[PDB]
Design a protein around this ligand. Structure first.
Ligand SMILES: *[C@H](C)[C@H]1/C(=C/c2[nH]c(/C=C3N=C(/C=C4\NC(=O)C(CC)=C4C)C(C)=C\3CCC(=O)O)c(CCC(=O)O)c2C)NC(=O)[C@@H]1C
Ligand SMILES: *[C@H](C)[C@H]1/C(=C/c2[nH]c(/C=C3N=C(/C=C4\NC(=O)C(CC)=C4C)C(C)=C\3CCC(=O)O)c(CCC(=O)O)c2C)NC(=O)[C@@H]1C
Ligand SMILES: *[C@H](C)[C@H]1/C(=C/c2[nH]c(/C=C3N=C(/C=C4\NC(=O)C(CC)=C4C)C(C)=C\3CCC(=O)O)c(CCC(=O)O)c2C)NC(=O)[C@@H]1C
Ligand SMILES: *[C@H](C)[C@H]1/C(=C/c2[nH]c(/C=C3N=C(/C=C4\NC(=O)C(CC)=C4C)C(C)=C\3CCC(=O)O)c(CCC(=O)O)c2C)NC(=O)[C@@H]1C
Ligand SMILES: *[C@H](C)[C@H]1/C(=C/c2[nH]c(/C=C3N=C(/C=C4\NC(=O)C(CC)=C4C)C(C)=C\3CCC(=O)O)c(CCC(=O)O)c2C)NC(=O)[C@@H]1C
Ligand SMILES: *[C@H](C)[C@H]1/C(=C/c2[nH]c(/C=C3N=C(/C=C4\NC(=O)C(CC)=C4C)C(C)=C\3CCC(=O)O)c(CCC(=O)O)c2C)NC(=O)[C@@H]1C
Lengths: 161, 160, 160, 161, 160, 161
């Protein structure tokens, strides 16, 4: 995978150039916002179970998907769904903490849409759950940290669609 | 970087980053400004480091630039100074990254397979980066020379 | 079912069903009429079993229907009686199937992951199906109450 | 996999309904014909080697496929063919005994046509062998048991084509 | 062949053929002319070998050509002489190949699964190729009969 | 895999015929040229490292591919490239020694073009390297042995394109 630092290094590596005056400023932008990223990660780690709980109750619960015939129906498929929200929340935190969505492309979104369309999982319902967590996470981490997380929340939703 | 390593280890065990691992990112971002100044100092004094390191390298190993050697001639000697420039450019990435992964992935993984095929003496290449270490560290301060030197030592050890 | 289990075990070893395994299907089909009557008795007395089991459940565990509990209010209490209806519907499948696989696959596999996320006390849910067992078995005969009760006990044990 | 009993349960499960008055009759139909299915399975198990032998001699033997150039030629490909008839006969017995062709879709027909078309096995010749076993099995098990087996014999042939 | 076997073993360990393995190809190509003459002698006297081997086979095992046996009748007996012709054709491939791989891959791999399904006695089939061995070797010289006979023995051993 | 001998055997096997008068001459052609093939293999085995070295310096070195941005750039991708030339030279020697390009189709060219196009390896540059080894090998082994090797060198290049 890549992060904000190594992504800039690889960009200069392919060109065969040293770290430019513009390239140094991109790193300084990441270092200056380093403590803000770490502060948000600790809050989400503490409220990991609560963010997923509120997101499911807001968007998913009390609807056709939870009822017989729906995809969330049965304890196996219900437990399998909240497990995905636990991944999406955890992998979104890595993308924010790293400052690069390379981890989402490799270890999450790679062949994810094809796996759902095969099994029969609704993508539209999954997006609403992730978008629900974006609003719930933003209230806890704040406006500054909430926006940065939202970039990688929307990146996961973009990969599914 | 330490941020990448902390995420990879955390993802392996299926868990959020621990308070200790988050602290390794906290000090990393605070000491990031220090390492950028070290990277710039080597970048500004790039041409001088390569020239002096070459002069010292060929003094200690004249056989490479003598008839029969690998770096015999103007073009072959100039190509050797480029190799030094490459590893100096990799060292600056290693410094700013906070670890030797950028140096490892690019110019060290399968490095002996390259030079053995080319017919270049790798202990001579290791002696070349020893010259860069001493010339590069002399420009930096006492504290910075100790930090930057550890990345040079890694490149020396990988070749040996 | 026993027919499904006998085929899966026979297919695993690459062989036709043994004389013993065929006999497990012979008695299964003969005693099928008996289990259908047991399933119908619970199906006819479906609304009564859920109501009485709920009344006994909230008597033994008032904290769930008290302020602060999971089943506080008319909607939250009504949703709890639906859970009881689900497991009663699963028990009728388990009876007619001759084993606890339909109960397991549907409403037991990852059941604690569901209720822990919802915040429902699972020992309270286990105490709920205890009430259904006693109310359901009272309608059935002495022999049928012993057979049908084993499926309820499996649902109790899975939750614990 | 599924059988006649669990297939009816899953049908009522997706609708979220108890066992209907019509659904109970479908189960009673399976239980009443339970001894007839078991009687047929024991006969085919005893005459497992003979049914495959007569079917091959009737349809496959003494023809281009057995001769050099054909697909049955060589002892490896000959032994591999009779092995398939041993599967088709065994998996057809499971489908009859279960009373549902779900086992044929999962553990037999799944990617079977693609495997043959790759290796170069003739599908038309394979169907005649299975249809040969249908006539041979029907004479042993009887008219009642022979028809029920024939449904799942024709189901395998339908999957190949 | 020995050339195929030497390449497969060399490719397995990721290396070029050893001086010893190359020498196994050197003698193989030199003695290739010898084995072709042996193959032609059996090919020219093809109809005679099959007829005499059949006559000796049915003398030692009359039950196969007697009522109730597998080779009873003109068509069934003629089909048995074709089997002998097949294995004689495989022996000629085995000789010219320098090893028993062509014999193994074609007419031996899963040979008992074939004959047990057909209902043919395989020890009778093994006794048939014993007759071919003695009739085939009698045409060849003393040195060639020893070489060609080893391929017949392999076909006998595989059936047993 | 197959060689010159077993390839002729399989040709007669599918027809169901003994070794023809024409088929015997094909074998005699291989046996007569047997010592010439073995002599060439020992020369290439001794000069295995030198043939790959000269071929890379002639075609690949000092160009865009070796420079930053190119596919040979970095020690990992450089070492991975010379490793391929070590395979192509070794597998070409097997094809020559066997006298049949069946080994190239099975254990080399099978899904090779798809693997490169995925990773982003230039096929045009790879062909020039193999064609470089063809000229270098021909000078060592001679005119007679050099032509025979060239058939299987060009066969690998044909498989890539
Ligand atoms: C009653 C004994 C206990 C109780 C239960 C309770 N449940 C809910 C909400 C839900 N329960 C389920 C249950 C299932 N879904 C399934 O697919 C299966 C297997 C077939 C089962 C058993 C579901 C899906 C929900 C979500 C609502 C929906 O259907 O969409 C609540 C409400 C929780 C809340 O606050 O929202 C309660 C209270 N409550 C108790 O006190 C008892 C211990
Ligand atoms: C929840 C919001 C939605 C939902 C999901 C659901 N998923 C499955 C089955 C699987 N889901 C995954 C997902 C992941 N695997 C990963 O490795 C990662 C991170 C890299 C994710 C997010 C996988 C692998 C499976 C298959 C495993 C399995 O045991 O099935 C189901 C069950 C589908 C089935 O029938 O098996 C469901 C229901 N369901 C919803 O309704 C929401 C829209
Ligand atoms: C003779 C020594 C024994 C014998 C043989 C016998 N064989 C058959 C029928 C067949 N035999 C074969 C044999 C082969 N097929 C192959 O592909 C190979 C490898 C190249 C071999 C050796 C085959 C394919 C048949 C089927 C006929 C066909 O060709 O389509 C019979 C007839 C059996 C019957 O009753 O139908 C017999 C009798 N019989 C003996 O008694 C000897 C022991
Ligand atoms: C016989 C009626 C026909 C025939 C068949 C034949 N099959 C093969 C090779 C394979 N056949 C299978 C079949 C199955 N695998 C399974 O798991 C099941 C049940 C779930 C079946 C029915 C498989 C897996 C193979 C590949 C294995 C292998 O070792 O090859 C061959 C050989 C093809 C080849 O060249 O390898 C043949 C000849 N041949 C006929 O002529 C009949 C039409
Ligand atoms: C100098 C200390 C030593 C030396 C070096 C030397 N190198 C070459 C030729 C090449 N060196 C490289 C090196 C790299 N490529 C990479 O991708 C990386 C990692 C980023 C490194 C370090 C390459 C690619 C070449 C090929 C030329 C090209 O760029 O295309 C030579 C020339 C060899 C020849 O005879 O052609 C020499 C002499 N020489 C010495 O004596 C020192 C020991
Ligand atoms: C060299 C002439 C060209 C070149 C090659 C190059 N290849 C790779 C990566 C792989 N190459 C292979 C090739 C083979 N695998 C085999 O098994 C065989 C013989 C049967 C061959 C020839 C494989 C399997 C890989 C993947 C393994 C890996 O570790 O990557 C690369 C690196 C691509 C990457 O980004 O990973 C390169 C550069 N490069 C050139 O520029 C020449 C045109």
């Amino acid at each position: 995978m890549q992060d904000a630092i190594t992504a800039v290094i690889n960009a200069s590596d392919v060109q065969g150039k040293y770290l430019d005056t513009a390239a140094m400023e991109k790193l300084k932008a990441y270092f200056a916002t380093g403590e803000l990223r770490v502060r948000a990660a600790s809050v989400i780690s503490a409220n990991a179970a609560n963010i997923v709980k509120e997101a499911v109750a807001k968007s998913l619960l009390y609807s056709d998907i939870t009822r017989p015939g729906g995809n969330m129906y049965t304890t196996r498929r219900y437990a399998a769904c909240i497990r995905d929200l636990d991944y999406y929340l955890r992998y979104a935190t890595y993308a924010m903490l790293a400052g690069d969505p390379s981890i989402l492309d490799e270890r999450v979104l790679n062949g994810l849409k094809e796996t759902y369309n095969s099994l029969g999982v609704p993508i539209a319902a999954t997006v609403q759950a992730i978008q629900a967590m974006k609003e719930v996470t933003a209230s806890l981490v704040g406006a500054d940290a909430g926006k940065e997380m939202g970039i990688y929340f929307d990146y996961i939703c973009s990969g599914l669609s | 970087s330490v941020v990448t390593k902390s995420i990879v280890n955390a993802d392996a065990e299926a868990r959020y980053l621990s308070p200790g691992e988050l602290d390794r990112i906290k000090n990393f971002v605070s000491t990031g400004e220090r390492r950028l100044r070290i990277a710039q100092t080597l970048t500004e004094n790039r041409e001088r480091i390569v020239k002096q390191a070459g002069d010292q390298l060929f003094q200690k190993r004249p056989d490479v630039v003598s008839p029969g050697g690998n770096a015999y001639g103007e073009e072959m000697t100039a190509t050797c100074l480029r190799d030094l420039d490459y590893y100096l450019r990799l060292v600056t990435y290693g410094i700013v990254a906070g670890d030797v992964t950028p140096i490892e992935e690019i110019g060290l993984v399968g490095v002996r397979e390259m030079y053995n095929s080319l017919g270049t003496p790798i202990p001579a290449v290791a002696e070349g980066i020893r010259a860069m270490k001493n010339v590069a560290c002399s420009l930096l301060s006492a504290e910075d020379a100790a930090e930057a030197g550890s990345y040079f030592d890694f490149v020396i050890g990988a070749m040996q």
